Design a protein around this ligand. Structure first.
Ligand SMILES: CC(C)C[C@H](NC(=O)O[C@@H](C)c1ccccc1)C(=O)N[C@H](CO)C[C@@H]1CCNC1=O
Ligand SMILES: CC(C)C[C@H](NC(=O)O[C@@H](C)c1ccccc1)C(=O)N[C@H](CO)C[C@@H]1CCNC1=O
Lengths: 306, 306
């Protein structure tokens, strides 16, 4: 028992990080087989970052202007191309540590682990959610770009995020690994507005199931509710609406704990209307919305990877 | 910017996990060079776990009664010995992925990353603190024992914890890698009492420095205080006393942010006396005490490992 914000084991992704330097700018790359993927602003100078024309700037670069370092080893670049907001540097050498992998574009509300890196080396790993407004609440400094977020399925690493920037409020924005930003952001040095952020209702419910599984049951009430009536109250408190697909996704938790989704909705309604009277659920004084139903099952049933 | 509960990159430790099976019981082992370290209750049956005599039970076992599996590969056991609450199984083969490592016994208040494993395979990684009462608030299921907690220094993995059990309230207890328990616990199936748990004051302060570094400054007051007067208020709210060594440890954060330790103590005093008026610090409605000063520096200055 116990419930913690757990990240995926990071080893398979650690073996793929490289450093990419183009002139003065250095950031992280992802080396899979014989291609290094990295953010395109690596070709910028500080002056270029205000108003960059990336197509222009890449025209000036040769393969040899990209210094790619894997540990102490320089990888010879033999080609380069730009795909949306990422660069693909073809290199001499296939990464012998390449895991089975996929590139995925996640949906809002979905979680993933970030391996925060500087100079091609890992600093730490944490778990994040793609927020409804297509930001993530990360921890990233100068030099972190090209860090990636991922999920694992047994042996397959699904890469879903590459880091590109920080937005006025200390939240973060990035791309899938085809270079398309999540949300309406661009890789340009400006304060960019994020949409108002909402709470991920299906994840709050999943976490309430995690609480019940772990014996923290005080918040359960005797009432039930309809999906419609719950989603009204959800609107008022800036909670995403709960769809029938979400109800289906919560099915296995519901059957394991004996508590129908809609009865859990009743309890959450009360929590939103009445707050918590300075009680905690799973050690938290706030309702937590960065565990998906699958995250709850993984942790609470001991799903492993290798 | 941003501040997250980050774990250490887990790869170096992932390469060391093995599965150890003795009859019906299976748990995790740590394979470093030609030795596998694992909890001694692996030699128990369910009946033995109530009242075990481990010396007796190990006498009955041959080297060949220990099935050690690294991935799909069975490692041949060529010797065994018991050191306090851990077994050391000497094996045929040195682990070629053994990192530079040390065994350390951490102090209460210190943090480390846990790599939660089942059947020798990783499930996830999270960060924990050794609580003042020598428990940790982990996430561990049946089969998790032999999972380890660690810190990294550049290239050196300091192993500090091996998991052995769960205590009545969903907290956890374990040993250093010489087999000595943290705290007064034993590896026996009984409800064991943990001391009352207290808050790690130096870590709360460090986290308040992390908040300031990240722009979340509302809680700072104009007052200062003396160490003595602060430690009185700390007693009342079940906070560990702050020593001069702790004040020294916070020195670098204090100099980076311009806020003397004792002035931060003044602000925390107010927080303890007045609570938070439903505000959050770094996204938390509670004062967080599982980041050490070093953890704050690592994250906020981008310290990496490889
Ligand atoms: C797109 C590219 C041209 C630069 C990008 N710009 C950026 O994020 O500008 C932020 C600071 C900003 C500007 C103006 C107004 C408000 C906010 C950038 O620096 N990305 C780094 C890459 O390593 C990661 C950043 C660094 C700090 N924290 C991160 O996550
Ligand atoms: C010492 C050894 C003989 C068994 C040990 N006993 C144990 O923890 O008993 C707990 C359940 C208990 C008993 C009585 C009263 C209150 C609590 C054990 O099972 N350790 C596993 C190992 O994999 C990890 C556990 C499993 C569940 N969560 C964990 O962390």
């Amino acid at each position: 028992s116990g419930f913690r914000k757990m990240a995926f084991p990071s080893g398979k992704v650690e073996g793929c990080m490289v450093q990419v330097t183009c002139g003065t700018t250095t950031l992280n790359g992802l080396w899979l087989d014989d291609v290094v993927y990295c953010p395109r602003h690596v070709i910028c100078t500080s002056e270029d970052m205000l108003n960059p024309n990336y197509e222009d700037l890449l025209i000036r670069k040769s393969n040899h202007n990209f210094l790619v370092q894997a540990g102490n080893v320089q990888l010879r670049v033999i080609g380069h191309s730009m795909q949306n907001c990422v660069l693909k540097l073809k290199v001499d050498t296939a990464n012998p540590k390449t895991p089975k992998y996929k590139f995925v574009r996640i949906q809002p509300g979905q979680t993933f682990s970030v391996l925060a890196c500087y100079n091609g080396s890992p600093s730490g790993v944490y778990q994040c959610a793609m927020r409804p407004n297509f930001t993530i609440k990360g921890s990233f400094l100068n030099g972190s770009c090209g860090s990636v977020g991922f999920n694992i399925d047994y042996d397959c690493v699904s890469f879903c995020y590459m880091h590109h920037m920080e937005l006025p409020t200390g939240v973060h924005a990035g791309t899938d690994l085809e270079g398309n930003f999540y949300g309406p952001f661009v890789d340009r040095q400006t304060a960019q507005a994020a949409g108002t952020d909402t709470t991920i209702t299906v994840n709050v419910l999943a976490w309430l199931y995690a609480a019940v599984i772990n014996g923290d049951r005080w918040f359960l009430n005797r009432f039930t509710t309809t999906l419609n009536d719950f989603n009204l109250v959800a609107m008022k408190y800036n909670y995403e609406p709960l769809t029938q697909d979400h109800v289906d996704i919560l099915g296995p938790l519901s059957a394991q704990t004996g508590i129908a989704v809609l009865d859990m909705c009743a309890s959450l309604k009360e929590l939103l209307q009445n707050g918590m009277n300075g009680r905690t659920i799973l050690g938290s004084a706030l309702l937590e919305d960065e565990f998906t139903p699958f995250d709850v099952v993984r942790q609470c049933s001991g799903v492993t990877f290798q």
